[PDB]
RNA sequence: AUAUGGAUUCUUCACGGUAACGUAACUGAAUGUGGAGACGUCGGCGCGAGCCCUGGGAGGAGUUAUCUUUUCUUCUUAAC
């Protein structure tokens, strides 16, 4: 009866990352000592990556294929979950209420994400995810 | 017209906030969409400015047989 758990995809609704898709890593159903409101701990993308045809050179690929990732803390009410899933135990460890509240260990964690994110897109699986929605 | 400083990048084109959003910055051609320019009249109410009224004090002037700590006057601050 429960769907928000540590596999779903979810649609980011506000916050500079509206209309991007995101996947939850840590939910916290009855708040926290901060954000005293049902949370979770996601990790999405900030800059999906470009089409890719044929006729694209080896050069040209790698450079459309980059993913910029992120990581934040998003209210319940903030989200949209889907139906979509999304395994998270490449990099379900890094990411977690400690590596916020220090700007050195974000970044750390956020490079985790990406190459995460980036073999994942390789031998395309997750197509859904890695689209961009249009709106 | 152009240099310097700052900012950004070895995760190439910045980060923070749950959010409304914040900042010294923080690539964007064709094409497309939206906003501003851009609007009637009357009625009462709220607020601002200039003026009017008035107290104390620091100056100048007038009246003074008698009365009047009195009558008149100066005390200002632009765009940005």
Same mark, same amino acid.
């Given at each position: 009866?429960?769907?928000?758990?540590?596999?779903?995809?979810?649609?980011?609704?506000?916050?500079r990352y509206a209309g991007k898709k995101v996947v939850i890593?840590?939910?916290?159903?009855?708040?926290?000592?901060?954000?005293?409101?049902?949370?979770?701990? $996601?990790?999405?993308?900030?800059?999906? &990556?470009?089409?890719? *045809?044929?006729?694209?050179? #080896?050069? +040209?690929?790698?450079?459309? %294929?980059?993913?910029?990732?992120?990581?934040?803390? $998003?209210?319940?009410?903030?989200?949209? &979950?889907?139906?979509? *899933?999304?395994?998270?135990? #490449?990099? +379900?460890?890094?990411?977690? %209420?400690?590596?916020?509240?220090?700007?050195?260990?974000?970044?750390?964690?956020?490079?985790?994400?990406?190459?995460?994110?980036?073999?994942?897109?390789?031998?395309?699986?997750?197509?859904?995810?890695?689209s961009k929605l249009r709106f």
């Amino acid at each position: 009866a429960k769907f928000l758990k540590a596999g779903k995809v979810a649609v980011v609704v506000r916050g500079r990352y509206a209309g991007k898709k995101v996947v939850i890593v840590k939910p916290h159903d009855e708040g926290s000592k901060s954000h005293p409101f049902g949370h979770a701990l $996601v990790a999405g993308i900030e800059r999906y &990556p470009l089409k890719v *045809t044929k006729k694209h050179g #080896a050069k +040209k690929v790698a450079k459309r %294929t980059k993913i910029k990732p992120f990581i934040k803390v $998003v209210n319940y009410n903030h989200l949209l &979950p889907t139906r979509y *899933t999304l395994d998270v135990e #490449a990099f +379900k460890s890094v990411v977690s %209420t400690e590596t916020f509240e220090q700007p050195s260990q974000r970044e750390e964690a956020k490079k985790v994400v990406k190459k995460a994110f980036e073999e994942r897109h390789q031998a395309g699986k997750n197509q859904w995810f890695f689209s961009k929605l249009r709106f």
